[PDB]
Design a binder for this molecule. Structure first.
Ligand SMILES: CC(C)(C)[C@@H]1Cc2cc(F)ccc2S(=O)(=O)N(C[C@@H](O)[C@H](Cc2ccccc2)NC(=O)O[C@H]2CCOC2)C1
Ligand SMILES: [Cl-]
Ligand SMILES: [Cl-]
Ligand SMILES: [Cl-]
Lengths: 99, 99
């Protein structure tokens, strides 16, 4: 698809069998999801945003469907205001910026 | 152009007669630039993201040249860690997400 930016680029994602709404975010290096349960071990990570840093849990090799495209990669879980699909997964679905 | 997302989508912009590096950010509703002087009136605003909120100065009807494309709109100025080109100006240059 071609997504214009007059509205937030929100899409449906599927993770852990649950449908959620997430933002396709070219300004985010990483993918960060609101609190949920994910399988396996997690590692600590600090991520910096507009107002400073938040502590998140890093889960690797997580299966996530984004707007119907399958991705498998790192998902961070923490106190984010919105579910964010960052560049680590936008590259897996073949996303580019065009003008 | 077509910009891939293996690295941060950083571009040169010209604003208030100055050249700066900025991130093309589909996840940002607004354009936020590091501290600089801009002409005209401003009003205070709070913008939120990962890590909480920052106070910024809102300048309206500001011209920015982004990759050689001229665009006019609201520019927020404040203590952002990175210069961000948000949707308000990405739409003006005809930027879309494609996959
Ligand atoms: C959350 C929300 C509400 C959608 C925020 C929306 C938002 C809306 C605005 F009008 C103005 C600013 C911002 S924001 O700028 O706050 N932001 C945009 C986001 O792309 C950000 C850019 C950025 C800011 C500072 C440093 C580096 C990059 N990346 C980010 O937090 O990456 C983190 C997130 C995961 O990867 C690293 C997220
Ligand atoms: Cl990844
Ligand atoms: Cl605007
Ligand atoms: Cl359009």
């Amino acid at each position: 698809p071609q997504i214009t930016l007059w509205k937030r680029p929100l899409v449906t994602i599927k993770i852990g069998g649950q449908l959620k709404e997430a933002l396709l975010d070219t300004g985010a290096d990483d993918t960060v999801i609101e609190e949920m349960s994910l399988p396996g071990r997690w590692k600590p990570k600090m991520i910096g945003g507009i107002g400073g840093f938040i502590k998140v849990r890093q889960y690797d090799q997580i299966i996530i469907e984004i707007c119907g495209h399958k991705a498998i990669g790192t998902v961070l879980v923490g106190p984010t205001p919105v579910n964010i699909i960052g560049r680590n997964l936008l590259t897996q679905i073949g996303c580019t910026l065009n003008f």
